[PDB]
Swiss-Prot record, chain C:
The ratio at which VP1, VP2 and VP3 proteins are synthesized in vivo is about 1:1:10, which is the same as in the mature virus particle. AAV capsids serve as viral gene transfer vectors that have been shown to affect long-term gene expression and disease correction with low toxicity in animal models, and are well tolerated in human clinical trials. Belongs to the parvoviridae capsid protein family. The N-terminus of VP1 is sequestered within the mature capsid. It contains a phospholipase A2-like region and putative nuclear localization signals. The chain holds residues 236 to 385 of 735 of the full protein. It is found in: Virion; Host nucleus, Host nucleolus. Capsid protein self-assembles to form an icosahedral capsid with a T=1 symmetry, about 22 nm in diameter, and consisting of 60 copies of three size variants of the capsid protein VP1, VP2 and VP3 which differ in their N-terminus. The capsid encapsulates the genomic ssDNA. Binds to host cell heparan sulfate and uses host ITGA5-ITGB1 as coreceptor on the cell surface to provide virion attachment to target cell. This attachment induces virion internalization predominantly through clathrin-dependent endocytosis. It comes from Adeno-associated virus 2 (isolate Srivastava/1982) (AAV-2). This is Capsid protein VP1.
Curated annotation (Swiss-Prot), chain D:
Belongs to the parvoviridae capsid protein family. The ratio at which VP1, VP2 and VP3 proteins are synthesized in vivo is about 1:1:10, which is the same as in the mature virus particle. The chain holds residues 636 to 735 of 735 of the full protein. This is Capsid protein VP1. Capsid protein self-assembles to form an icosahedral capsid with a T=1 symmetry, about 22 nm in diameter, and consisting of 60 copies of three size variants of the capsid protein VP1, VP2 and VP3 which differ in their N-terminus. The capsid encapsulates the genomic ssDNA. Binds to host cell heparan sulfate and uses host ITGA5-ITGB1 as coreceptor on the cell surface to provide virion attachment to target cell. This attachment induces virion internalization predominantly through clathrin-dependent endocytosis. AAV capsids serve as viral gene transfer vectors that have been shown to affect long-term gene expression and disease correction with low toxicity in animal models, and are well tolerated in human clinical trials. The gene is VP1. It is found in: Virion; Host nucleus, Host nucleolus. The N-terminus of VP1 is sequestered within the mature capsid. It contains a phospholipase A2-like region and putative nuclear localization signals. It comes from the Viruses.
Length: 500, 500, 150, 100
């Protein structure tokens, strides 16, 4: 009643990765100084379930959005079933799959996070949306410091085989229950009233903003300074306690191809933070409001995480094949991404010189300042690991979800290499041959969510999330007639309304 | 001894509001896109006691300022007395007030804050300063999202009658004790030493700032880079641990009409944050220091909340009829509002190009940074509701007072409509007529304050707040000979001195 | 959790009906043979709350539709408050409402249903949708067998 | 709605007639005059509903009832600017889906 438990069970296939041997991997040294990576590739696979749509069926998601104001994932239970190791013997063109009971796969869990975490970056390879599908475990790798392609001196590589790990044969299974230490309830509610209007019209404040700096006298403007009292007549000048959230300004781009300029500003015009001498695009953004009200076409170049409609190639894809999220629910407490955060007086008045004001493009945090975090879409990651550092501010990550000091440890799985026909005489060199094999089947993961129940005493019927009445060739979220599951649009997590 | 209890008792009159029926209220659609409001007007009245001068007599306030370093409001007790409902029967010109024992007034308290809070915005209608006065309850209303005058889709209206409420007849009374959950002690102390001077002169530091970049050689300047050690000789270059508080720069305006420019910059020149496509003046400001030392004339266009001397019309009022606060006590830890926060190097040195530096007009928060909050004036609001959001920074509100996650629930009071002479035959339409009536009398509110006692071992006699020896036609805070209570000047909350 | 409780409170005004005296009421005998009614008009008023929108705010209604498959009304609790009897003295054009503590209003409940029920026919006079409104009690009457007007 | 063999009894309310200035001498006829009066205020009714909770294991997002995003001069179910409450459309009781 208070809490919902979502059990999901999926079938997996772990291929042999990197021929059972580590490799470092680097940039091709044609890349710009901004993109270079020294990190290592690893034989181990890992399971990434951090998506929402992994756990929640779109119904249970719908049922979760609009019936309550917030949710956090208390408890996680995770286990594998029915591990079976197929060993392929390929002769001629015959695949000739064959099964063996002896060979084992070995699974390692982090517990303490010795290894680089490498989740919450929204990599693919997550458990697929629709349970009938079977997914290929994803490769495991990680990056370290680099100067160009070279590794500098501090680059460490952590060799996962050394860690103690429990091996699994056919007919074995293992659970580990992991408990999310804590986290504030995610905010599932959009606000009913914007910061700029917090106040009833009928009672005018007792304070005085400057109304008129000048007054007419002889047809020449006298300098007499005047005041006036804030009221329903002019709300703009009314004093307020609070300030809107931070703003890191981005670039607008319109879904209509005619409005956007013709040139490539994609890299140059986009906002980016420039770190360690190599600049990096800020894709996710700082949780800014997507578009000014009454637009719904303009969207910030970055700052709206963009899920692709499936069947879309990664190399280049036109606007129609990707679904672009909307932050419009945040317009109340946070500035529009594109719109400048405000204006600030540059110089001082004097009899000789007129006042001047320069816009503030990017505003940090000030005291007495509130901001509403980015929503968690059905396709968005549920957590991210708070990087362990001496200091941080408001750990809720930009991409979305729950910042966790201790996140669920990513388990790493590798099938044990089985050598093939050792030579009769002795040789000191390591084996260059192996039995080609892979292991498969049955991951089962369930997470126990808290739910903050909705009691909203508003008289007005509240907005919900609902599918359209209109007939269609294929229902939204329905598997297509060729057997390909599909998600039409992203689902924002906040359709409910709560007074600010 | 440790804690002070202030009991105030005032007489109130609740008229019938909006003819016992809700109305939405909107802008006249002549207003600029920046000021529009869709919100609703409500038959209910509410009690706003959040002022200081409500609770504290100027003496007890004086007694509270300069004898101790801080105070917070632990416990609130609130009750009404002697409710009596007058029913006016107006025939000819005769008012013909008449009393009835049967009719009842119904009072509702929020407890959980379902309704929009609508306090701490410093609206009028608060309990009047001087207890002999009797005040008209203020109207209750609230605003929601709007696109222009229209209501968009998320605008909710919360119909207060639906909530359970206990009705009150003549001879009934009700209390609710509300306890302020917590809050840091407000800072009643100005600092004895500014951040820039934290350090004794006599012992020079062990660090080296650059003193001279160049040196004379052949009458041409050699590039030899030199260092020197910070000491009492030059304090400006001395290294310090800490940084001054945040700065959001505003515009200066001088109380002398000759210095200010002749033009209207009031809207254009003033600093404003631009939200949801409609810009909003920042009246209260971000707790900046009012004026540079040795000025006391220049004051920031916004940022100093300005109380009017009574008897001042709201439409336009000259400088003399409003009292302007001074933040000068904050000059130590916070930058002057007008003065730029500092300078920052734009470009890099090279043999060809000279260094350059651009001023930073507005600075966010950086680590290792301290700021002193705005003082609470005798006329200023004591609390404000921390808007409920997923994240916020340093909730102490800009206007002043104590940020509260849970603020005292504003109670809403409405006299029960009594229909008048129903037609004999039946009619389905609701009644358009009522007995014109109002209820009145005796609100009693008391709040239990903590006090952090002052022990300051300084040898020097400390500054206090005191009335002037000089004779005058009317004493400060004395009721005028016509019976009109008056407050000459605002009273800052910090006259005490405490070493930083 | 399993069950929802909806409390509504409305203000009502009961006028004097039919000058405190019963009357039979009939068709005007111009009506067609298909519409004729002999029934009686009664000084009593009654309360008709059987509407939904009486009890459920549109939100709570919305909240009730799409979160669950069915609902039935177990228990009903009903009460009146603050009855006050105004006595109007009309002279000239002055209405001159005046209140008196002595006069009483008398309420009857059926318990066993002796009287003709006369609800569920969706008559007006139900408690109004929006609680701020105040409603005129509705008249009470009933019909019986008739041959024409007789 | 619900057919009920025993429905909640409709309560009937009448203000007691108060005669006005009886003639001094006796008369057998009933009074033709009365004090014109009416009584008023405060009916409070509450009903306790059962609810059969929805558990529908369909994978497809189900239809709900919701107000439209579109801006308007007056919100649905919002009291009009003249103080007149209004209901735009009837609300059917079944938007949920259950396999037959």
């Amino acid at each position: 009643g208070d809490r919902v438990i979502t059990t999901s069970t999926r079938t997996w296939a772990l291929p042999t990765y990197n021929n059972h041997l580590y490799k470092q991997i680097s940039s091709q040294s044609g890349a710009s100084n901004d993109n270079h990576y020294f990190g290592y590739s690893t034989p181990w696979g890992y399971f990434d379930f951090n998506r929402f749509h992994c756990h929640f069926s779109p119904r249970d998601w719908q049922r979760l959005i609009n019936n309550n104001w917030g949710f956090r994932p208390k408890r996680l239970n995770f286990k594998l079933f029915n591990i079976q190791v197929k060993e392929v013997t390929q002769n001629d063109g015959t695949t000739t799959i064959a099964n063996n009971l002896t060979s084992t796969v070995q699974v390692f869990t982090d517990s303490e996070y010795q290894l680089p975490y490498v989740l919450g970056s929204a990599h693919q390879g997550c458990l697929p949306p629709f349970p009938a599908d079977v997914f290929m475990v994803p490769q495991y790798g990680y990056l370290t410091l680099n100067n160009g392609s070279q590794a500098v001196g501090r680059s460490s590589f952590y060799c996962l085989e050394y860690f103690p790990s429990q091996m699994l044969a056919t007919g074995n299974n293992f659970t580990f229950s992991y408990t999310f230490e804590d986290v504030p309830f995610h905010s599932s509610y959009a606000h009913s009233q914007s910061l700029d209007r917090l106040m009833n019209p009928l009672i005018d404040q007792y304070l005085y903003y400057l109304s008129r700096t000048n007054t007419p006298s002889g047809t020449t403007t006298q300098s007499r300074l005047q005041f006036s009292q804030a009221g329903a007549s002019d709300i703009r000048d009314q004093s307020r306690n609070w300030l809107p959230g931070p703003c890191y300004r981005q670039q607008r781009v319109s879904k209509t191809s005619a409005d956007n300029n013709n040139s490539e500003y994609s890299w140059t015009g986009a906002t980016k933070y420039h770190l360690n001498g190599r600049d990096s695009l800020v894709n996710p953004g700082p949780a800014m409001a997507s578009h000014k009200d009454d637009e719904e076409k303009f969207f910030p170049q970055s700052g709206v995480l963009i899920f692709g409609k499936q069947g879309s190639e990664k190399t280049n894809v036109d606007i129609e094949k990707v679904m672009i999220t909307d932050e419009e629910e945040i317009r109340t407490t946070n500035p529009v991404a594109t719109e400048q955060y405000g204006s600030v007086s540059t110089n001082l008045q004097r009899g000789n010189r007129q006042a001047a004001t320069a816009d503030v493009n990017t505003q940090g945090v000030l005291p007495g300042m509130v901001w509403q975090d980015r929503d968690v879409y059905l396709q968005g990651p549920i957590w991210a690991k708070i990087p362990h550092t001496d200091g941080h501010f408001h750990p809720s990550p930009l991409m979305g979800g729950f910042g966790l000091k201790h996140p669920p440890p990513q388990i790493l799985i590798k099938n044990t290499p089985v050598p093939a026909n050792p030579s009769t005489t002795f040789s000191a060199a390591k084996f260059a041959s192996f039995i080609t094999q892979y292991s498969t089947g049955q991951v089962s993961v369930e997470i126990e969510w808290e739910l903050q129940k909705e009691n909203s005493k508003r008289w007005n019927p509240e907005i919900q999330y609902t599918s359209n009445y209109n007939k269609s060739v294929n229902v939204d979220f329905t598997v297509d007639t060729n057997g390909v599951y599909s998600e039409p649009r992203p689902i924002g997590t906040r359709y409910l309304t709560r007074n600010l």
